[PDB]
């Protein structure tokens, strides 16, 4: 119980300084201004809001407080919003990489900072849409109790939140890296292939990351709907879960360092 709390909160201040680490360095140097790096900067806010308000959420609904049911259910589909935020973030990342590689010479024409801005406000509020349908509806509400289990329904997880949501926007961008790859091979002007696909290599880590650490906790929860006649998960696979899934928000800063030449030079910098 200690423990959970314990490495939630750590995972936290990682995940905000790691993610405002990324922003500030974006922020800083112009050359880490690009079409990419903005999609970049608003999966580092989604971690930011993982770090700084989802996991103190977290811990808030691991100790059952009873509040008012819009609060209830608001304290527990937050962390859905950012979750979605990531995966738009990271379809428009595998999408631009795509434009990048398929057709480089009209890249500059097809993407501009303006339609990356606008991409990424339609994607931030498509998220906060999605991952607060409990809101405006299919709750199993009817102070509650704040219980996940009792408050959110799980034909909502298991049918809107995951397989609409998250395997299709999944499967549809695997299909986008093995095209941008594919697309690489085909190619192969030599120096900057390279680093189209280095920089597409890395990108597709952040996101190989992300389905490794979510779908833990996407199939308990399918494994609790589809068969009710068996037992309920333990409560320790449970948090386990959690904390996996809360894990991917603060890998990302570490894969732009450990990847990325330009990032590791400005961190070092900023240090
Ligand atoms: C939820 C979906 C999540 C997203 C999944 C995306 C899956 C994409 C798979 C892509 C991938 C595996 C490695 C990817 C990185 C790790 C990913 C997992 C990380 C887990 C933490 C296999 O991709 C191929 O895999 C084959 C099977 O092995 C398939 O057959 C192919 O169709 C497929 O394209 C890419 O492998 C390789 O692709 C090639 C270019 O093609 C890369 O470039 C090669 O070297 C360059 C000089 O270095 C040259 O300049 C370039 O000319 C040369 O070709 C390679 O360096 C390497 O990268
Ligand atoms: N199923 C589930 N449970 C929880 N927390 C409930 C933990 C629990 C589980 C069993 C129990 O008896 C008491 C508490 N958080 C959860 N978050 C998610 C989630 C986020 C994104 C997709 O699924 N699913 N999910």
């Given at each position: 119980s200690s423990v959970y709390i314990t490495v939630e909160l750590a995972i936290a201040v990682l995940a905000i300084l790691g993610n405002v680490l990324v922003c500030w360095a974006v922020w800083l140097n112009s050359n880490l201004q690009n079409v990419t790096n903005y999609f970049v900067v608003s999966l580092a806010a989604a971690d930011i809001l993982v770090?700084?308000?989802?996991?103190?959420?977290?811990?808030?609904?691991?100790t059952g407080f009873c509040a008012a049911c819009?609060?209830?259910?608001?304290?527990?589909?937050?962390?859905?919003?950012?979750?979605?935020?990531?995966?738009?973030?990271?379809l428009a990342i595998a999408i631009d990489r795509y434009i990048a590689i398929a057709i480089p010479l009209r890249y500059n024409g097809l993407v501009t900072g303006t339609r990356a801005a606008g991409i990424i406000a339609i994607c931030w509020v498509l998220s906060f849409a999605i991952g607060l349908t409990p809101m405006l509806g299919w709750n199993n509400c009817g102070q509650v109790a704040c219980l996940f289990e009792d408050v959110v329904p799980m034909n909502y997880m298991v049918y809107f939140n995951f397989f609409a949501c998250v395997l299709v926007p999944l499967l549809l961008m695997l299909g986008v890296?093995?095209?941008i790859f594919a697309a690489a091979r085909?190619?192969?002007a030599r120096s900057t292939l390279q680093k189209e696909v280095h920089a597409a290599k890395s990108a597709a880590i952040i996101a190989g990351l992300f389905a490794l650490c979510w779908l833990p906790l996407h199939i308990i929860?399918?494994?609790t709907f589809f068969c009710p006649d068996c037992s309920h998960?333990?409560?320790?696979?449970?948090?386990?879960?959690?904390?996996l899934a809360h894990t991917n928000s603060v890998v990302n800063?570490?894969?732009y360092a450990y990847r990325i030449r330009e990032f590791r030079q400005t961190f070092r910098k900023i240090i």
């Amino acid at each position: 119980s200690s423990v959970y709390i314990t490495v939630e909160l750590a995972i936290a201040v990682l995940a905000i300084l790691g993610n405002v680490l990324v922003c500030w360095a974006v922020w800083l140097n112009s050359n880490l201004q690009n079409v990419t790096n903005y999609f970049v900067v608003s999966l580092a806010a989604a971690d930011i809001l993982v770090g700084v308000l989802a996991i103190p959420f977290a811990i808030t609904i691991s100790t059952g407080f009873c509040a008012a049911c819009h609060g209830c259910l608001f304290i527990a589909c937050f962390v859905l919003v950012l979750a979605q935020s990531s995966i738009f973030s990271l379809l428009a990342i595998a999408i631009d990489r795509y434009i990048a590689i398929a057709i480089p010479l009209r890249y500059n024409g097809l993407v501009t900072g303006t339609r990356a801005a606008g991409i990424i406000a339609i994607c931030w509020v498509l998220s906060f849409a999605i991952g607060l349908t409990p809101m405006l509806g299919w709750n199993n509400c009817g102070q509650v109790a704040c219980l996940f289990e009792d408050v959110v329904p799980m034909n909502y997880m298991v049918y809107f939140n995951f397989f609409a949501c998250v395997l299709v926007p999944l499967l549809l961008m695997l299909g986008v890296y093995l095209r941008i790859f594919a697309a690489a091979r085909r190619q192969l002007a030599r120096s900057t292939l390279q680093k189209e696909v280095h920089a597409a290599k890395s990108a597709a880590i952040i996101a190989g990351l992300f389905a490794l650490c979510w779908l833990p906790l996407h199939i308990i929860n399918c494994f609790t709907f589809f068969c009710p006649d068996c037992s309920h998960a333990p409560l320790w696979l449970m948090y386990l879960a959690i904390v996996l899934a809360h894990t991917n928000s603060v890998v990302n800063p570490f894969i732009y360092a450990y990847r990325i030449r330009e990032f590791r030079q400005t961190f070092r910098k900023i240090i």
